[PDB]
């Protein structure tokens with residue numbers, strides 16, 4: 001790991017330690033997916049472990065106008081996670097100290113004298129694969145509290161930064177979490193919610209690593225297990241030793257990445273492994289139930305574990321229904337991308353997730369960039385997802401959605417493999433065409 005990035009994290013640590021000293025309340029601004037919430041939890045946790053105080057604002061998206069409304073307000077430290085690198089200039093205007101812990105492409109702008117900017121892109125590192133907002137927040141606070149390291153990896157998995165291994169900075173965090181004693185790693189089937197779902201349901205809800213034929217299909221997962229002689233209504237731990245062996249070898253046929261590293265932390269037993277945690281935060285994020293999600297990151301797991309578990313159930317059921325909708329009505333294919341459109345409010349905040357999973361399952365052609373579109377009154381919210389070989393051939397979704405969205409005065413961005421945008425509904429056809437041309441240019 002580059003020395004410079006630990007050094008920059010130390011500098012954020014120091015600025016954070018100072019504003020706590022003077023008693024005053026830290027302002028935490030973050031995103032609403034697993035990375036954003038876990039990133040916000042890394043920080044809240046650090047600040048709690050020194051009896052400090054914080055106000056959280058969670059956002060779907062950061063705009064120039066929120067930053068101006070941040071511009072009034074009298075707080076002396078603003079801590080941005082998973083956002084803000086792209087608005088460095090506007091953020092620089094704030095009169096008060098700022099920390100930005102992000103893993104998106106920075107705008108080209110002079111970072112303020114009161115701004116400490118921690119971002120893998122600034123240190124030769126890769127923000128798409130090797131470090132997320134949660135890891136960056138960890139690096140910012142590691143020298144105050146090492147116990148948040150598992151949270152950091154939850155955010156990495158939220159952002160799909162596990163491909164048969166943590167890599168880069170995330171590997172570094174994993175190792176440091178293991179020597180702290182707060183993370184354990186062992187080999188096993190990487191099923192969803194192994195301690196709280198019966199096996200057929202655990203299989204149905206294993207979206208990553210994906211299980212073609214089984215994932216999203218309760219009937220098929222049930223019949224599958226009967227076919228191979230493995231009990232379907234028992235939880236995975238409760239199976240016989242011989243049923244475990246049969247199931248490894250049979251699921252490994254379907255996808256070999258299903259057997260691998262499982263990440264546990266004693267603080268999260270009774271909820272599940274690290275990917276399960278990330279699952280829970282996404283369900284919390286999608287239902288606008290921040291506080292329960294953030295609360296889970298601090299330890300507030302009383303009757304509220306049970307509330308999160310049941311948000312998760314309904315989210316996973318909307319994801320199942322989501323996927324069947326894609327199998328039913330497939331995509332609409334242009335030259336260089338394909339898209340999927342909805343006004344069903346039920347697919348409100350999951351369009352991005354169901355696109356990613358449809359591609360891993362290869363229900364939609366994984367080599368053709370996919371844009372999911374949710375109507376929002378007079379606007380349309382775009383969630384673009386592709387795969388690594390498409391990125392290797394030149395696709396960059398963050399670049400293409402920013403530039404296409406900006407032709408309509410709109411906002412877009414993200415990373416190479418996944419991005420967002422907001423455009424007027426009236427401009428959908430024209431936006432999609434423009435995105436189609438740019439992706440053509442990027443691959444030609």
Ligand SMILES: [Mn+2]
Nearest residue numbers: 035082133159
């Ligand atoms: Mn992120």
Ligand SMILES: [Mn+2]
Nearest residue numbers: 031033035082
């Ligand atoms: Mn995010």
